[PDB]
Design a protein around this ligand. Structure first.
Ligand SMILES: [Mg+2]
Length: 121
């Protein structure tokens, strides 16, 4: 089954998103901040990353910068899922390599369509 890394400092958000992913039969790996995410990425390669922006220790923009600095990481599709609604926040995430920027409030239907689309690229 496809593996998804979910990176967000709100466990309740991760749990909600995980339920939607698990319903499609995907395996889910979680991370509470950007540093924890990169640590886990040293040891495995997911098929997709779902990435929050505002997080303690290391934010999502810094994560995107670090993903570009490794051959085995740079090709993993990233969906940014964030409460940052600004056109400027979206611009920066896309410039740093994110495939899509999705805004909270979260929609499982909108989300899963995008996840399936990217996994079937
Ligand atoms: Mg956050």
């Amino acid at each position: 089954s496809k593996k998804v890394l979910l990176v967000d400092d709100s466990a309740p958000i991760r749990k909600m998103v995980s339920f939607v992913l698990k319903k499609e039969g995907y395996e889910v790996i979680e991370a509470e901040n950007g540093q924890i995410a990169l640590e886990k990425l040293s040891e495995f390669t997911p098929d997709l990353i779902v990435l929050d922006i505002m997080m303690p220790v290391m934010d999502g923009f810094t994560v995107l910068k670090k993903l570009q600095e490794k051959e085995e990481w740079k090709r993993i599709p990233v969906i940014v899922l964030t409460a940052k609604g600004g056109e400027e926040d979206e611009s920066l995430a896309l410039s740093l390599g994110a495939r899509k920027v999705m805004r909270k409030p979260f929609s499982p239907s909108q989300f899963i369509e995008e996840v399936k689309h990217l996994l079937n690229e």
